[PDB]
Symmetry: C3
Subunit: 383 residues, 3 copies
Amino acid sequence: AVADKADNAFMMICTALVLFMTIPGIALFYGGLIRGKNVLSMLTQVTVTFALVCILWVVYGYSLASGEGNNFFGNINWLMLKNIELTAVMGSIYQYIHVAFQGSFACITVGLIVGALAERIRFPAVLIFVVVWLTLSYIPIAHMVWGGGLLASHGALDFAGGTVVHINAAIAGLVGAYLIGKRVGFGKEAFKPHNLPMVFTGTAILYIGWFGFNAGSAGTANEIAALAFVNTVVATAAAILGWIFGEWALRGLPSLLGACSGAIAGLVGVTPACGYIGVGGALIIGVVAGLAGLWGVTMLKRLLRVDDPCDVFGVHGVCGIVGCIMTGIFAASSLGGVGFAEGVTMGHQLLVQLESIAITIVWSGVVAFIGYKLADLTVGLRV
Amino acid sequence: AVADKADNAFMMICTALVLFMTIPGIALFYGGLIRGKNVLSMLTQVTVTFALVCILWVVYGYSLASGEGNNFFGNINWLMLKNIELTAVMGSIYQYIHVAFQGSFACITVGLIVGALAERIRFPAVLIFVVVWLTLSYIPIAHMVWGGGLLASHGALDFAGGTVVHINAAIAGLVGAYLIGKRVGFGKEAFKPHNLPMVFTGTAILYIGWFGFNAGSAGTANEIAALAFVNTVVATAAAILGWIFGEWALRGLPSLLGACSGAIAGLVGVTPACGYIGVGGALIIGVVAGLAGLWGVTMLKRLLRVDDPCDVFGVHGVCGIVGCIMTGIFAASSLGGVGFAEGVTMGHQLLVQLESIAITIVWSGVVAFIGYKLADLTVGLRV
Amino acid sequence: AVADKADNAFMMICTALVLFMTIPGIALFYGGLIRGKNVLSMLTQVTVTFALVCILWVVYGYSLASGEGNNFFGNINWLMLKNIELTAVMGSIYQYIHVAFQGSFACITVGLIVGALAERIRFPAVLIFVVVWLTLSYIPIAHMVWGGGLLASHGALDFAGGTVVHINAAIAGLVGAYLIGKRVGFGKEAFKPHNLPMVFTGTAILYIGWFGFNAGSAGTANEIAALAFVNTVVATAAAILGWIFGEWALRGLPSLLGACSGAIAGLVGVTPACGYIGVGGALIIGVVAGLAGLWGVTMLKRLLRVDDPCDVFGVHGVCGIVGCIMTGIFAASSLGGVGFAEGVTMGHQLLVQLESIAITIVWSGVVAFIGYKLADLTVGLRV
């Protein structure tokens, strides 16, 4: 078709915002959660894997994720963006912008994993893992949800990536935490308060960039982008309050980490639902995501028993799941949502959401497992 | 009417930029002005009150601030954005974007107050204060200036919030500093130089986000937005130089805090004038605001005698006043400005500006007083 | 003509992004490369010189850089933007936005110089230097390349400033490092690892802002902006990998500084080429720029023998040169590029690129020399 310059502008900026989430958003976020001794290594890994993803994305990621093919992957007709005229239009923007925007999603997804595990994984091993997981889990899942694949064919609702990004990364990260052990130094059993301002800063950058992430997922600066934008503001706020309220009632006082985690919880929770729900639904999903996230990390604490950056996956995983399920409810017009597809009832949509979640969890988990093992067998995983 | 996607795009990005001012802009700004021992508490308060404002805004703030009603407040027909079709257009953008943009202003305004006072106010108390002050001071004043209220009816010129944001927050903050005492630890009588890079960083983020704040106030990516943008660059630069020049002549040397304060001084000063003045007027307002800000904080130092984050209110208050008054002068075409409204002379405009300033100061001061007292009587103000 | 609001929106945001590169991008970048004892002074100098540039730009910079005149400078018909109607259109955006966008380039260029040298130059001296160098080197070179001057007339290809910004600043900075000595404290012979996260953060901000820098150089949110955007993502990623690969093979391990330097190397390298090359060309230029940058700083280390913020100029200078030369190759359609101008062959384009590089190096070097000497003779250069 013909590109709308307003959409081109909106989408390029949204892409920059999503890139901002990884560089430096997620890096600063984790920077404040890990011991100073491993910060440089983590930042190096996040930066290098970010570069790797950017390259793999243009080389074949975009083609296999967005190209037309089957239910699990696209094709290789767009390797290095070959056959894509610069003036080619995807939706209402130049396809090149579509490439960049989708690539930025691959980046933050990988950043979520690497930022948490970098400190316990060999550099060469993380590179191998990223290649394997990006290629076999991210790309296929991205194709399944946004590339007209299996999940999209089943009518799975996921506006900005509750599955593709959050659940996908959460499971990969948790498998990594499961396979790769980490010696907790004496006196380092809890996140160091002094470094928390960096967590706040990273959270802030993730939040601001998330507007490009959520609203940009509309692919145009229209009313849906506006809705997604407002719902992002609302769900985040509601989750911050939900988490802080729960924390206050559970610990007697709010904490900075709680407030930040609440923000992430709402952002993750609203990710799949933002363009399909009403503001009231966003507020409810936010509150529930905030409380669910608190519950999740509390549960992880029982397993780990110590503060660990991988606790982040508890939020992305639990809140991603909660958000995806909740989207199946709040997408209803009776609830101020956009509506379900033709012939779809809330009950059916919920089942589809659950199916999408289950497939994503198993798919990412299996691929992550293979990735870590391949890395271990080849160069060795653990630092 | 019909939404212009270019404006939708511009305004959503501008909204993200304004949100960036609070999260993490103002938090980092104050983070570098308070003692490390209170940074976490301040960040938590800024984050939670930010969430609270976001929610209150959508619940009733937007309706009471922008809905049509009387001279002081709107209506409750838009509670939770009810009755607002997603495709509803306000100006040339979807109303939902208008909601978000205006909400971001409420956020930075509250952030300005909370960031400075958080360290000396009980958490539960700040929540009560925000509810009271946002509801009774911010919303009414916002309605008076941008909601077709009293001040707008009198022709008060305030492009981006010299009154609604800066003077409003400054008075609320100063009343808080007046009512809530703070024990200055030994050796903590001056801002710690080591933390100043954070003040710079916060200032930088506030500056960049301020473009969304000022230019976005045009409500469209037009020539007025362009003017506001250029004037923001110019006034800020002129104020940095004005402050640094004054500081140099007063102390014999420039300082980082002086440079940053100068930037804020110009940003605040040009806020009400940016879309109504010429670049020459912006340069003059900038220089004067920079010098006025320096004068203001110097005066506050005589009362406080110690460096305190609340010194920030001296800049927002004095520069807000200076900017609002100066707008009444430089809006003149003889001076390269846009012009005064029908039948308006510079003398009359100046009186209107003064009236707006006086009303804002008294209104915010009274409401803030009530807010702090209610908080004190209920849960206790002081930490 | 008539302004396109989508382009207005895109360009104002891109301008904000470019400003973000200086405030606080480059400041944080250098903040992590200099000793804590000089950070405040550097930040003050970067902030004040930034303000100075902003003012000089509107006063006469824009007029002399973009006004029509001769091969080396424009005119003074636009002093303080006089004679520029607010509704005046330049390209497809309001001229005022053009003024702001170009001004932001002047700012980051000066920021690149000041951030590195501030710690060793007297404050009054840096002000004098900036006035001299901005006025006689930046403005003329900007006019020569983007103001229809000498280089543009010869068909020099430089999409976003390989010459105007990077080479120009690099030579000015290196001349400064040559003329101004710096005593290296004992134990401060290598960059302090503890401050490197700030370098990463600055690099990240520079990277994100660079999208406004490169894509905004298209002057419209079109397919060229999209191309530039994608090539920026790709070249940066390729350079990060190229540098890290070289570093790994040279030192046995990657480093955070290496990863960050690689990013800057790719960003600089692709700056002149981004809107003229294909993604494959961007990947190749990125890899080469990354390796060239590593080579460059390695060479500077042999001359300096110690880590120094001025090492940054090795990257901007070498990568700027490499990028400008490479643009003469990859602009070819056989290589996926846009094409050479009428009657131009690759060989001729390469010669033109070399001429542009040579002129920029000599021009900036001579002017910088004069600037530093004038400052030295008047107030004294060295701290």
